[model samples]
Target: VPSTGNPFEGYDIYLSPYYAEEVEAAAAMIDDPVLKAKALKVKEIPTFIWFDVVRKTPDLGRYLADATAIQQRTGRKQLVQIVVYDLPDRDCAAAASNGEFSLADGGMEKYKDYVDRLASEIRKYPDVRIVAVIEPDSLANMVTNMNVAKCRGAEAAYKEGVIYALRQLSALGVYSYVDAGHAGWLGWNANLAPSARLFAQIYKDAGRSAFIRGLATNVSNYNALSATTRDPVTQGNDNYDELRFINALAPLLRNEGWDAKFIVDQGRSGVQNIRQEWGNWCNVYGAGFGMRPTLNTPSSAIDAIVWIKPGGEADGTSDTSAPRYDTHCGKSDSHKPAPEAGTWFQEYFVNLVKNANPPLAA
Candidate 1:
């Protein structure tokens, strides 16, 4: 059975060597001396490693082994973070970051197989704690984007796939937090109630396992960790920042009978009001590194502030002719000359380093 206690307690969050290499590679291309040094500091911080495709699944075992070695050498406990991101017709409302599966192609079955493999791998590391941000934007779309045909069609698979993931991961004693899209997407009065209801029902569907700890908000989005004053784009939505979103949504979730904790991603949210619209989420200009990962959050409802999205990875290609290009990626607010989603954007990475909030160590 999973621990009822906080999974993050008594563990030193693992600093992924895989991410270090990526950051180092991006840094090597930098010509600016001060910026490159600051960029290198990012490698020292902990961030989630994504297992978003079948080929990437094996890396979990490799990373676990690395974590084990570090623990053995240093005699310290380590917590590894990962994002369980593949769902059938994934990112249905967006074109740039869709997954490798679809419902028509027996994707649900394949997704189960994927989860099974992940569970098997994770089970091998019973001593190490694992936290998974399960299926980003899957259910959020169900609440708000049903008007889009793909989201409408994907509703069943999204529900089923998330249920399967929660069951599998919870059985392994892994802490699983389902993704709750940022305040901008679901923090409104109209969206919050239904989102809470949908998440509560899904938790019930997943057997209400004790290991299903709570929700992860702001994964890969540029939203303030907490703002004293609301941004103009937020307009009437009071959840203009992540802290307020949690404060608002957590109670509704509890009323639905699932008292949930949260994790918010501040990976690229250092600057606010840069986006022309709240909906433009590709690669926003002036985005900088936000707060580093820490357990010290303003609200008790939040478990930790995390960097779920690695800083250097591109959100989507700005190239108009690219097959997977989304208009959001090419908007005036988005950084330009970007490569395809998930590719390294060195220019953007340097900018993130330069603009980092609290600033990287000099």
Candidate 2:
């Protein structure tokens, strides 16, 4: 537990519900019993996930209460981390993770109302620090796959939803990061500038854009953000490295309007071997747990390297027998295909810790 009043000051990474359970499974796999015991006591990277107001009862107030109380009991400032993922027509082309609302049907009001409530609850914890990773895959997919029906038609909703989220969270002093696509997605020279331009366009609404502190790349995806690592996509392409990507993308973002900082997710990018193709993002094989959350960065623009995606959460389904299976996890994958999105895969969790890049931290 951290004793600092400022939760975000140090690089303290937080964890969620299934971590302990997953670690127990992880411990059983370690060859050395002593190291396995150490793994049992280990503190892994941590992050929190929020819900679509309609899906789960999420109760942010309860979340705040529990976290704040933990701080009081343990004599540390609990890192109140949260993920906002319910965008109208989310995951447009991908049906597995798509949300119930769509901008075409005027679902923006309901979405805004939910975000407004979330902000209000967060505002209650005046003394506590909150880091909100707002809307993963919302804006990034919108910009990258414009030709996709939902992405094209819901453009207005996507923009408005992002703006609304930024504005509301900003008003409440929540540290917000807009989820941009990963190194693999924006690594190409052609996709890079346009993505930045699209990002700049969203912040045009000063009302909402002012709230953005930085951009989050590789949220819930396996892409190493380390400067030392080679590009996962091009292998030898330094331009595709997370650090290089930031160096390239940050300037482009600043050139447009706001000089927003950057945050890259190193949740599954720890290992150097890039087994999957640039296009195959779902549960790539041989991914190890990367850096634990820390503020130490080689770049000035990056606020922190965070574990935005919990290691065990599945990217999407590999079950071809299932109704909706994506080919990304088909023949090319190195490991066995993962379960559906968000389902915990214990065996994969064990491998992540075992294959950790720098290895798991003490």
Candidate 1 lDDT, 1-362, residue by residue in tens: 76656679889999877789989998889887887788889998899999889788889998888888888999999899999999989999986554899889999999999999898899778778899999997999989999999999999999999999999998888899999999999998789899899999999999999889899999999889888778888998978998888888999999998998899999998888888799888888889999999998888888899999988888899999988778888899999999988888888888899889979984
lDDT of 2: 0.70
Report model 2's TM-score to 2 decimal places: 0.86
What lDDT score is found at residue 266 in candidate 1? Answer: 95
Using lDDT as the measure, the top candidate is 1
**How big is the positional error of residue 150 in model 1, measured in Å on the Cα after superposition?**
1.0
Best by TM-score: 1
All candidates' TM-scores?
0.98, 0.86
lDDT of each: 0.89, 0.70
Q: For candidate 2, give the lDDT of residue 121.
A: 77
Model 1 clashing residue pairs (backbone) = none
